[PDB]
Design a protein around this ligand. Structure first.
Ligand code: NA
Ligand code: NA
Ligand SMILES: [Zn+2]
Ligand SMILES: [Zn+2]
Ligand SMILES: [Zn+2]
Ligand SMILES: [Zn+2]
Lengths: 61, 61
C-alpha cells in the first residue's frame, strides 16, 4: 500500500481501474499513464511523453 | 529524428514496431516500454515499473 498504490498487496484486488492510484500495482488494473490519452495511445507505449497538466494534449493524435 | 526516434517527423512513417527507437514518435508504433513485458502489461500501463536489464522480469505476472 505504497504511496503510489493503496491496494492490498496479496494479488486479490479487483480495483480494475476504479482506484485513485498514481502507479497501481494490481494486475487487474490498466489505467492510462495520463489524463489526456487512452491507455492504448501509440506514442505513449514506450513511455509517457505528455506534460502532466491533465486536460488534453498537443503531442498525441 | 531526435536521439530517441530516428524516423521521419512528417506523420508518414509506417515503422509499426519494426524500428530500433527507444522512444518512437510515430503514431503507427506500439512497442512495449520494456523487453520483459508485452505492450499490453497491466502493471506497466501507468508507467514502466521494470528494471531495464532486458531478459525477463520478476515484478510482472
Ligand atoms: Na509508440
Ligand atoms: Na495497471
Ligand atoms: Zn487494486
Ligand atoms: Zn488499480
Ligand atoms: Zn517511425
Ligand atoms: Zn517505430
Amino acid at each position: 500500500m505504497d504511496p503510489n498504490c493503496s491496494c492490498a498487496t496479496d494479488g486479490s484486488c479487483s480495483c480494475a481501474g476504479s482506484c485513485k492510484c498514481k502507479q497501481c500495482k494490481c494486475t487487474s488494473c490498466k489505467k492510462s499513464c495520463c489524463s489526456c490519452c487512452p491507455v492504448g495511445c501509440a506514442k505513449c507505449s514506450q513511455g509517457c511523453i505528455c506534460k502532466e497538466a491533465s486536460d488534453k494534449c498537443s503531442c498525441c493524435a
